[PDB]
Amino acid sequence: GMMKENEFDLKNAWTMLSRAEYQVRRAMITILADKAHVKLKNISEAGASAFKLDSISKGKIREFVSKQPKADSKWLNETYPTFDLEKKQIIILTTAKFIKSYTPFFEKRSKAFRYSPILKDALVVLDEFDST
Amino acid sequence: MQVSDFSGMIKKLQSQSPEHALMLLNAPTGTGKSYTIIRALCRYAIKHENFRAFFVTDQKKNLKEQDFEVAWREESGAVHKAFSERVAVVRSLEDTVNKLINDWDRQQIPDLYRSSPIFKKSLENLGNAFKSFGMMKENEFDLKNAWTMLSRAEYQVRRAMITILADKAHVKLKNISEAGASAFKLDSISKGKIREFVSKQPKADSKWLNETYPTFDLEKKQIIILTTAKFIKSYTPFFEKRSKAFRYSPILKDALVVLDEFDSTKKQILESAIDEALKIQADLNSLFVDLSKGLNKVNEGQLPAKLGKSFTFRDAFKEILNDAEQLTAEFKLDFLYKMEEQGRDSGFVMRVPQTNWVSVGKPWNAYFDEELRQVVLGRQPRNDLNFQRMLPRISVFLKGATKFILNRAREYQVSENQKLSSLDDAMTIEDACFSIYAALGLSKSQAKILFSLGHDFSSPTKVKTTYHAHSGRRFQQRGLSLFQFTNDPQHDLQTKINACFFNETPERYLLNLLSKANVLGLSATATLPTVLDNYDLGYLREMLGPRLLDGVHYLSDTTIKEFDFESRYAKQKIEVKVETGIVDRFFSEILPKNNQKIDNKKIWELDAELAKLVNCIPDKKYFARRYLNLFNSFVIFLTDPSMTSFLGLQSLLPGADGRMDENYIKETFTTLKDLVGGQDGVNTELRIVSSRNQEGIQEQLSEALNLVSQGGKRVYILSAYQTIGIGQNLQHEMNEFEREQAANIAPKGVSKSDRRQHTIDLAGMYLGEVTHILSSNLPFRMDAAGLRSIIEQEYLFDANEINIKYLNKYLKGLQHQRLERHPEYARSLYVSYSRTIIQALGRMNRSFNKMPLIRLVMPVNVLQMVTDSGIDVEKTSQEYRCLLTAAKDWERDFEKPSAEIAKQNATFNTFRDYRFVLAYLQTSKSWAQIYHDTRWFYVRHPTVSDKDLKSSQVFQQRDDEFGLQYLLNEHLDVSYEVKPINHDNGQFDFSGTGMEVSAEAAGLVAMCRYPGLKEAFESLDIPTKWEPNERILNPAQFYNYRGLLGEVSGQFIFQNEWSLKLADFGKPENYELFDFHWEGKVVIDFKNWRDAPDVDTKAERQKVEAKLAKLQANTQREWRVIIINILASNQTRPVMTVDGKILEISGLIDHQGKFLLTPEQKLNVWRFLN
DNA sequence: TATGAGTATATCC
DNA sequence: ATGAGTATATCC
DNA sequence: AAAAAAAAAA
Ligand SMILES: Nc1ncnc2c1ncn2[C@@H]1O[C@H](COP(=O)(O)OP(=O)(O)O)[C@@H](O)[C@H]1O
């Protein structure tokens, strides 16, 4: 926020903010991993930077948070919609975000909305069509 | 020591204009080293207007800006130059920004930039950027981006200043730059006008501009003061956006570089080198393919004639193209390498001059899947491409090709600089190399990695037949390489082999610097023998010879006699007392157990507090000893009506963690002060001099010592070795107590105006453990710590301090995360420990007044670790000598294990050289000549004098000691005995008994007993007996020696007896397969061995039949083969295989030199010969 | 030689 | 899968 | 007409 004046250095500040947010996400990932008994070690040792997982481990995490109490799972889903995007029936966003990418949970490289399979057969409602 | 001595040193160094010698000076601290070098540099700069010098030191607290200003003021006599246009201080970007902000806050900007609104806005933006940079200093990933933002802000400030100066000089900036924005590319004339204007400007304005921006006119600066870290990196010129490296700048040509912390610089340089090596990585396959493609474009004349006509006329170019084609065909590098992972970590592969290394055990294999049209890489047993051979071969090719391209780029730069009229915008060697690489079609990253394989180092010119630079240290010559395999979904079709090469050790950087500038190295420990915290002086002297000068040759003997202190200390009855701390667990052991017992409870909750603090650490039982040693030290401090100044140095700075907790130490000190010492401790205080405080170390030290000089107190200064352990002044002005208590040791013939006559040195020092001599990081990954670890071990191996056994054990431990103990008899470890201790003890030798009794307190480990091996204790401080006399109970012997390790390492290196040369001689022609020459050198004289070995056609032609690693005979013996451990790996033990190297296996016995054989030896100039001389062959060399001797003798006797003339082969790709041939019918192989053991018949037959089969496929004939032995002890029996194609004869002549081949045998010989 | 004449919004690199 | 116990400096 | 140095196996 201190460096929102110039745009040339906005890229670097955005990069630092993204790295910090990714660290927060990694902390949450390892918390849920130790709370779900999942072999975080596979990642945590073979992935002490990249931190990749497999489908079954994230599925176990998702089904654990599914049966979790209402309040905490509610906060997690509200703040991190990308935690499980293939279950969201409605996705509300700005067109500036729609053109750009979204950063999935359990991952660091962002994925563009344009090529993602989530748009296939979806219905896109442009609330101000001409202004878009 | 007088300034005339350093003037003589400087003028001697400047007389080496085309050679650029290196001069080193050992002088104990507190002798004038830094006082007089500054005066000498200033005086020489004033007298000679074309003299340029650099003053380099590791820590900016040792830059001595004020000392340079004072010396310049007192040296200039008539003109009185403002010292800002002659002497410059090149600060980092952060320090420049800090000075700018401070000047802005103190109204010190000279009202010309202040009045402008553009400048003010730029300064406000710079202040915000500096605040952000300070906030983001925690994570090093954000450090790069914060630094980039700060650099952009500083550049905007510079642009504002440029516009302000341009309009005042009527320069059309915009027109010179660009009506638009990003530009400001001014011509030489405009900036010349600007420089003229500031030259005629009022003095205050010019002084501020020149101090803040020394790079405003960098050519006028005669002395340039900067840190080692800044010297390694680049400086940003004024008027420009891109920074220019000091390394390739024309500012260094014929300059004099004064490294005031040689040898402390090496580590810094090393660290920087490691970081740079990790920044630059590229896919090896694509890099090689692109370079090959570019070179082929050069061949077909598709590049401008300027470089094309210089590439093509050299035979090395044709050879490089041929090697590129052969390597592309051999390793299938045209195709994609795909490495299938199911998710398991791949680790990485290391290549060190001794071996390959895989971090996950199973070696990597690669074959060509023809159906897939890919190269499958993985852990499968199938290895049809020799991947572990592919990785280093491509690296060797890249290194050689890049050296060729560097030579061509040097030629191109020299030719292009002729065209330029104003030699102010000349292109550097780096620019020429980048232009060549870009013209070849390589990317910018590929150009960076190819250029870093060797940085503009191409040697001199056949040394003009002066001195032969030779070295047997393999790590300095080959470096090391790292490879990691990466799979990404965005390049799903292939696996990237990211490569990381480390070649520029600090010694190589220093040699490259010496290729263009004189270097003067100054410290009290400049020549301590150690390769961990000092340059490899052995390697430096090997590669420099006469160019490695000595400084003490330019001092009067009075100064050297003044270096002594054991006489002056005795004459004034100064007594040094070493107190070692035998403390393990609890605090009653440090309290004075004399019968003034206060309470048996208060110390118990003191122990409880200590245990509580230790337990709250996120190993224990060791931090307690550190705390107790420190507490014992300042108990000793608190119980003496003396010792007005005490310094306690550790290897750790007090902070927030429990392992060394700051406020806990403070409260412990206060409790001990009110618990021990009634009137002794009331006048005491504690100061923690640290970089974590909100003010510079200079004022912290100044106020801590003013507490004693003026406050009438007794201070305990606690800090770390890395903070104020080197080159820091800790003396203070005396008080009445010190005046009436201290003693003076000033030599007869010293002035009263000297500051050393009005100050008093420290009266006591606590020497904590020096902890980080060798790395201990455990998770071994491809990062800075792992590289530092591997490089330290390679340095130890080069200096003959660890053998291949210990290195293999260490690597195996690293594969398992089970690091081994430090080597017990590695001299460098103890010498580095001693170096830190010596530097620490030099901080209390900066004055002539000393307290009558000095107390040095340290734990027992410091006593056990220090040593005197290669350290001239005669010219060291008396405190260190007393410490050594106290530590004499643990003195080690390093000469013996070093000698045997040197023998083992020389043998191992010879064996590795020969393992390489056979495989390469497979497909070479000249290296056959080198191998022939080396073997004949072996047999012409097994024992050779040192000068005779150094001056030879085989030693003067190779630039290293390939195959020529002779042992050392301290007794000039003619024989020795060695027990082989693993002859497959070339490992030998020179204390065991399993084989004899002497003339008994030579022609002396059982070989000269043949008619005409001794005549053949005397005709071929092969001595019959090993004459006692200096150096003797090693077991790896003795193998080839006896093999060639047996070859000659057996072929001679075979020709004498069977009366047949054999012929040699003439096809290059089938060398080292069979010794000779016979009439296109037979291939003949000769052997020299002991009595026949229970040798593995099947492996020998498999190998000989494999070479036979490849010769069958190549010669288009069916061939026989003969295996022949020269000496035996029983009945000879030539046994053939059932088919009858292979002959095996064991022993030709007996031990009496007469053959054992009867008429029957003979005839069979004829029958097999046909 | 020749005109038209802002403020504001949002996200990744 | 134990041996051993850090601070200093500066460009991308 | 000044490119280097490339065993297996652990
Ligand atoms: N004529 C002199 N010769 C040498 N040192 C002097 C002289 N006059 C004063 N000094 C002081 O003596 C001290 C010796 O330290 P110095 O020589 O700078 O470091 P070193 O002895 O490590 O080279 C310095 O602090 C310097 O200011």
Tab-separated table of N, CA, C and O in Angstrom, chain B residues 917-993:
chain	number	residue	atom	x	y	z
B	917	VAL	N	42.951	-40.602	-19.489
B	917	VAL	CA	43.728	-40.536	-20.719
B	917	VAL	C	43.532	-41.792	-21.547
B	917	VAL	O	43.574	-41.731	-22.774
B	918	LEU	N	43.307	-42.945	-20.913
B	918	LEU	CA	43.033	-44.142	-21.708
B	918	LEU	C	41.735	-43.986	-22.501
B	918	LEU	O	41.699	-44.205	-23.724
B	919	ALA	N	40.667	-43.569	-21.818
B	919	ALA	CA	39.371	-43.432	-22.470
B	919	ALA	C	39.412	-42.383	-23.572
B	919	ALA	O	38.738	-42.527	-24.597
B	920	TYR	N	40.177	-41.307	-23.375
B	920	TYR	CA	40.266	-40.302	-24.431
B	920	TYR	C	41.182	-40.750	-25.563
B	920	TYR	O	40.880	-40.518	-26.739
B	921	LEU	N	42.302	-41.395	-25.233
B	921	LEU	CA	43.223	-41.912	-26.233
B	921	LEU	C	42.544	-42.909	-27.148
B	921	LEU	O	43.008	-43.120	-28.274
B	922	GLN	N	41.461	-43.528	-26.681
B	922	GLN	CA	40.591	-44.293	-27.569
B	922	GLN	C	40.351	-43.588	-28.903
B	922	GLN	O	40.375	-44.229	-29.958
B	923	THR	N	40.129	-42.274	-28.874
B	923	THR	CA	39.750	-41.503	-30.057
B	923	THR	C	40.553	-40.204	-30.141
B	923	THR	O	40.001	-39.109	-30.269
B	924	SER	N	41.878	-40.303	-30.041
B	924	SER	CA	42.735	-39.132	-30.167
B	924	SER	C	44.073	-39.540	-30.764
B	924	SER	O	44.392	-40.727	-30.875
B	925	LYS	N	44.851	-38.537	-31.161
B	925	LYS	CA	46.161	-38.776	-31.758
B	925	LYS	C	47.303	-38.118	-31.000
B	925	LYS	O	48.339	-38.753	-30.793
B	926	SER	N	47.147	-36.859	-30.580
B	926	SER	CA	48.235	-36.178	-29.885
B	926	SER	C	48.387	-36.690	-28.458
B	926	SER	O	49.510	-36.899	-27.976
B	927	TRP	N	47.271	-36.900	-27.764
B	927	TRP	CA	47.352	-37.366	-26.390
B	927	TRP	C	48.041	-38.716	-26.299
B	927	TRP	O	48.600	-39.044	-25.249
B	928	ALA	N	48.055	-39.479	-27.391
B	928	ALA	CA	48.958	-40.618	-27.484
B	928	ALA	C	50.402	-40.168	-27.326
B	928	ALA	O	51.193	-40.813	-26.631
B	929	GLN	N	50.765	-39.058	-27.974
B	929	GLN	CA	52.126	-38.549	-27.854
B	929	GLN	C	52.422	-38.101	-26.429
B	929	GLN	O	53.515	-38.352	-25.909
B	930	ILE	N	51.461	-37.441	-25.777
B	930	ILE	CA	51.673	-37.036	-24.384
B	930	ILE	C	51.845	-38.255	-23.482
B	930	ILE	O	52.721	-38.285	-22.610
B	931	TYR	N	51.007	-39.274	-23.671
B	931	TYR	CA	51.097	-40.484	-22.859
B	931	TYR	C	52.432	-41.194	-23.070
B	931	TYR	O	53.080	-41.628	-22.106
B	932	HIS	N	52.862	-41.299	-24.328
B	932	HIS	CA	54.175	-41.848	-24.652
B	932	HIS	C	55.286	-41.071	-23.963
B	932	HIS	O	56.191	-41.664	-23.358
B	933	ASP	N	55.228	-39.742	-24.040
B	933	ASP	CA	56.265	-38.909	-23.450
B	933	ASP	C	56.315	-39.082	-21.939
B	933	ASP	O	57.396	-39.165	-21.350
B	934	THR	N	55.150	-39.149	-21.292
B	934	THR	CA	55.126	-39.321	-19.843
B	934	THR	C	55.691	-40.674	-19.431
B	934	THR	O	56.469	-40.758	-18.475
B	935	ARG	N	55.314	-41.748	-20.130
B	935	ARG	CA	55.846	-43.062	-19.775
B	935	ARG	C	57.357	-43.114	-19.961
B	935	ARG	O	58.087	-43.664	-19.122
B	936	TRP	N	57.853	-42.547	-21.062
B	936	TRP	CA	59.293	-42.566	-21.263
B	936	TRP	C	59.999	-41.668	-20.260
B	936	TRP	O	61.123	-41.960	-19.849
B	937	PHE	N	59.346	-40.592	-19.821
B	937	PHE	CA	59.919	-39.793	-18.746
B	937	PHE	C	60.014	-40.608	-17.466
B	937	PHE	O	61.001	-40.514	-16.730
B	938	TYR	N	58.988	-41.415	-17.188
B	938	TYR	CA	59.034	-42.309	-16.037
B	938	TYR	C	60.256	-43.211	-16.105
B	938	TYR	O	61.037	-43.297	-15.151
B	939	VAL	N	60.442	-43.885	-17.240
B	939	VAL	CA	61.494	-44.898	-17.311
B	939	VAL	C	62.887	-44.309	-17.516
B	939	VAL	O	63.878	-44.995	-17.246
B	940	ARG	N	63.001	-43.064	-17.982
B	940	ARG	CA	64.325	-42.474	-18.157
B	940	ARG	C	64.975	-42.148	-16.822
B	940	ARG	O	66.206	-42.146	-16.721
B	941	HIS	N	64.181	-41.816	-15.815
B	941	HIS	CA	64.697	-41.607	-14.469
B	941	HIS	C	63.592	-41.751	-13.430
B	941	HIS	O	62.755	-40.854	-13.277
B	942	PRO	N	63.559	-42.871	-12.703
B	942	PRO	CA	62.525	-43.073	-11.680
B	942	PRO	C	62.625	-42.067	-10.551
B	942	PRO	O	61.609	-41.584	-10.046
B	943	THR	N	63.847	-41.754	-10.141
B	943	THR	CA	64.101	-40.692	-9.182
B	943	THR	C	64.671	-39.497	-9.929
B	943	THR	O	65.623	-39.639	-10.702
B	944	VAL	N	64.088	-38.327	-9.701
B	944	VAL	CA	64.454	-37.123	-10.433
B	944	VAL	C	64.564	-35.968	-9.450
B	944	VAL	O	63.783	-35.872	-8.499
B	945	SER	N	65.553	-35.107	-9.664
B	945	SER	CA	65.680	-33.922	-8.835
B	945	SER	C	64.557	-32.941	-9.151
B	945	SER	O	63.927	-32.994	-10.210
B	946	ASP	N	64.308	-32.036	-8.205
B	946	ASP	CA	63.171	-31.131	-8.325
B	946	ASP	C	63.304	-30.233	-9.549
B	946	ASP	O	62.383	-30.141	-10.370
B	947	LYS	N	64.456	-29.576	-9.700
B	947	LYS	CA	64.651	-28.695	-10.846
B	947	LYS	C	64.663	-29.472	-12.154
B	947	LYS	O	64.221	-28.954	-13.184
B	948	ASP	N	65.165	-30.707	-12.135
B	948	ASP	CA	65.150	-31.523	-13.342
B	948	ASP	C	63.731	-31.885	-13.750
B	948	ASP	O	63.431	-31.957	-14.947
B	949	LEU	N	62.850	-32.122	-12.779
B	949	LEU	CA	61.456	-32.393	-13.101
B	949	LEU	C	60.743	-31.141	-13.589
B	949	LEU	O	59.941	-31.209	-14.526
B	950	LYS	N	61.025	-29.990	-12.973
B	950	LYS	CA	60.336	-28.766	-13.367
B	950	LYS	C	60.699	-28.341	-14.782
B	950	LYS	O	59.853	-27.795	-15.498
B	951	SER	N	61.936	-28.575	-15.202
B	951	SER	CA	62.405	-28.212	-16.536
B	951	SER	C	62.447	-29.479	-17.382
B	951	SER	O	63.425	-30.230	-17.345
B	952	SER	N	61.382	-29.715	-18.141
B	952	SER	CA	61.304	-30.875	-19.016
B	952	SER	C	60.271	-30.600	-20.095
B	952	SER	O	59.392	-29.751	-19.934
B	953	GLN	N	60.382	-31.334	-21.200
B	953	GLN	CA	59.421	-31.170	-22.282
B	953	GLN	C	58.032	-31.647	-21.898
B	953	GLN	O	57.049	-31.201	-22.497
B	954	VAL	N	57.927	-32.541	-20.919
B	954	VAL	CA	56.626	-33.041	-20.496
B	954	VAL	C	56.020	-32.182	-19.392
B	954	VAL	O	54.796	-32.152	-19.234
B	955	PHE	N	56.848	-31.483	-18.623
B	955	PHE	CA	56.346	-30.630	-17.557
B	955	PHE	C	56.083	-29.206	-18.015
B	955	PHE	O	55.166	-28.559	-17.498
B	956	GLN	N	56.855	-28.707	-18.974
B	956	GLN	CA	56.725	-27.335	-19.438
B	956	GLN	C	55.675	-27.172	-20.526
B	956	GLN	O	55.466	-26.052	-20.998
B	957	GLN	N	55.013	-28.251	-20.933
B	957	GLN	CA	54.115	-28.207	-22.075
B	957	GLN	C	52.652	-28.419	-21.722
B	957	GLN	O	51.798	-28.272	-22.602
B	958	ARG	N	52.336	-28.757	-20.478
B	958	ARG	CA	50.989	-29.175	-20.133
B	958	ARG	C	50.279	-28.216	-19.185
B	958	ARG	O	49.048	-28.271	-19.087
B	959	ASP	N	51.016	-27.343	-18.494
B	959	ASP	CA	50.473	-26.297	-17.627
B	959	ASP	C	49.905	-26.873	-16.336
B	959	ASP	O	49.540	-26.126	-15.423
B	960	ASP	N	49.844	-28.194	-16.237
B	960	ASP	CA	49.596	-28.859	-14.968
B	960	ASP	C	50.558	-30.036	-14.887
B	960	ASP	O	51.506	-30.142	-15.671
B	961	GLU	N	50.321	-30.930	-13.942
B	961	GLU	CA	51.241	-32.023	-13.660
B	961	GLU	C	50.661	-33.360	-14.098
B	961	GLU	O	50.779	-34.362	-13.391
B	962	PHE	N	50.021	-33.385	-15.268
B	962	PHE	CA	49.308	-34.567	-15.734
B	962	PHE	C	50.189	-35.805	-15.702
B	962	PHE	O	51.146	-35.913	-16.471
B	963	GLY	N	49.864	-36.747	-14.821
B	963	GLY	CA	50.647	-37.956	-14.686
B	963	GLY	C	51.937	-37.748	-13.925
B	963	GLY	O	52.534	-38.709	-13.435
B	964	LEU	N	52.383	-36.503	-13.823
B	964	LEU	CA	53.678	-36.187	-13.226
B	964	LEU	C	53.515	-35.694	-11.790
B	964	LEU	O	53.932	-34.595	-11.433
B	965	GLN	N	52.919	-36.532	-10.952
B	965	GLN	CA	52.813	-36.255	-9.523
B	965	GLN	C	53.800	-37.178	-8.821
B	965	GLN	O	53.432	-38.243	-8.325
B	966	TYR	N	55.057	-36.759	-8.771
B	966	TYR	CA	56.073	-37.531	-8.081
B	966	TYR	C	55.928	-37.354	-6.578
B	966	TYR	O	55.492	-36.307	-6.096
B	967	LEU	N	56.302	-38.387	-5.836
B	967	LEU	CA	56.249	-38.325	-4.385
B	967	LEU	C	57.412	-37.478	-3.878
B	967	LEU	O	58.132	-36.837	-4.648
B	968	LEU	N	57.605	-37.458	-2.565
B	968	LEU	CA	58.701	-36.728	-1.949
B	968	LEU	C	59.503	-37.681	-1.079
B	968	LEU	O	58.931	-38.402	-0.256
B	969	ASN	N	60.819	-37.690	-1.268
B	969	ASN	CA	61.724	-38.503	-0.459
B	969	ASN	C	62.477	-37.562	0.473
B	969	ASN	O	63.463	-36.934	0.089
B	970	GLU	N	62.000	-37.461	1.714
B	970	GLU	CA	62.694	-36.644	2.701
B	970	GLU	C	64.052	-37.222	3.071
B	970	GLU	O	64.924	-36.478	3.529
B	971	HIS	N	64.252	-38.524	2.876
B	971	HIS	CA	65.512	-39.183	3.190
B	971	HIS	C	66.283	-39.589	1.943
B	971	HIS	O	67.303	-40.276	2.056
B	972	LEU	N	65.819	-39.181	0.763
B	972	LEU	CA	66.459	-39.527	-0.506
B	972	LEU	C	66.592	-41.038	-0.661
B	972	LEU	O	67.558	-41.545	-1.233
B	973	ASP	N	65.604	-41.767	-0.152
B	973	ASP	CA	65.626	-43.216	-0.239
B	973	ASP	C	65.349	-43.668	-1.669
B	973	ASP	O	64.839	-42.914	-2.501
B	974	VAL	N	65.703	-44.919	-1.952
B	974	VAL	CA	65.519	-45.506	-3.273
B	974	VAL	C	64.425	-46.556	-3.294
B	974	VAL	O	64.235	-47.213	-4.326
B	975	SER	N	63.701	-46.740	-2.194
B	975	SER	CA	62.696	-47.787	-2.114
B	975	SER	C	61.637	-47.400	-1.097
B	975	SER	O	61.888	-46.612	-0.182
B	976	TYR	N	60.445	-47.966	-1.265
B	976	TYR	CA	59.420	-47.840	-0.237
B	976	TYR	C	58.396	-48.947	-0.427
B	976	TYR	O	58.441	-49.699	-1.402
B	977	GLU	N	57.490	-49.057	0.538
B	977	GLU	CA	56.504	-50.124	0.563
B	977	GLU	C	55.127	-49.545	0.849
B	977	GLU	O	54.968	-48.691	1.726
B	978	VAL	N	54.136	-50.010	0.094
B	978	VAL	CA	52.785	-49.472	0.113
B	978	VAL	C	51.796	-50.626	0.129
B	978	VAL	O	51.982	-51.622	-0.575
B	979	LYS	N	50.738	-50.490	0.927
B	979	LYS	CA	49.671	-51.477	0.930
B	979	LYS	C	48.501	-50.948	0.116
B	979	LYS	O	47.898	-49.939	0.505
B	980	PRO	N	48.154	-51.561	-1.010
B	980	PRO	CA	46.997	-51.083	-1.772
B	980	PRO	C	45.698	-51.421	-1.061
B	980	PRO	O	45.501	-52.543	-0.592
B	981	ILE	N	44.814	-50.435	-0.976
B	981	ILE	CA	43.494	-50.620	-0.395
B	981	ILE	C	42.476	-50.992	-1.459
B	981	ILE	O	41.764	-51.987	-1.331
B	982	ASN	N	42.404	-50.200	-2.525
B	982	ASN	CA	41.556	-50.514	-3.672
B	982	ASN	C	42.264	-49.970	-4.912
B	982	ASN	O	42.105	-48.801	-5.270
B	983	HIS	N	43.044	-50.836	-5.560
B	983	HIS	CA	43.718	-50.458	-6.796
B	983	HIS	C	42.728	-50.114	-7.897
B	983	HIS	O	43.093	-49.414	-8.848
B	984	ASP	N	41.487	-50.592	-7.789
B	984	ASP	CA	40.451	-50.191	-8.731
B	984	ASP	C	40.150	-48.703	-8.614
B	984	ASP	O	39.811	-48.050	-9.607
B	985	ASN	N	40.247	-48.153	-7.406
B	985	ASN	CA	40.000	-46.738	-7.172
B	985	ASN	C	41.302	-45.975	-6.938
B	985	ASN	O	41.273	-44.782	-6.629
B	986	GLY	N	42.446	-46.636	-7.084
B	986	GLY	CA	43.714	-45.972	-6.860
B	986	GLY	C	43.964	-45.538	-5.436
B	986	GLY	O	44.572	-44.489	-5.219
B	987	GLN	N	43.520	-46.318	-4.457
B	987	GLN	CA	43.712	-45.991	-3.053
B	987	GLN	C	44.868	-46.801	-2.482
B	987	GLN	O	44.903	-48.028	-2.613
B	988	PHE	N	45.801	-46.116	-1.833
B	988	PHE	CA	46.982	-46.761	-1.288
B	988	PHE	C	47.243	-46.242	0.116
B	988	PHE	O	46.895	-45.106	0.446
B	989	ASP	N	47.856	-47.083	0.944
B	989	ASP	CA	48.265	-46.713	2.292
B	989	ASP	C	49.779	-46.798	2.361
B	989	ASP	O	50.353	-47.870	2.144
B	990	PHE	N	50.420	-45.678	2.670
B	990	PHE	CA	51.871	-45.585	2.663
B	990	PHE	C	52.489	-45.932	4.005
B	990	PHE	O	53.704	-45.791	4.171
B	991	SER	N	51.680	-46.374	4.966
B	991	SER	CA	52.190	-46.938	6.203
B	991	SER	C	52.101	-48.455	6.245
B	991	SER	O	52.747	-49.070	7.098
B	992	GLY	N	51.324	-49.067	5.348
B	992	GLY	CA	51.161	-50.504	5.324
B	992	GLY	C	52.224	-51.203	4.497
B	992	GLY	O	53.173	-50.600	4.000
B	993	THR	N	52.047	-52.517	4.354
B	993	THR	CA	53.017	-53.375	3.673
B	993	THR	C	52.256	-54.403	2.842
B	993	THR	O	51.841	-55.442	3.363
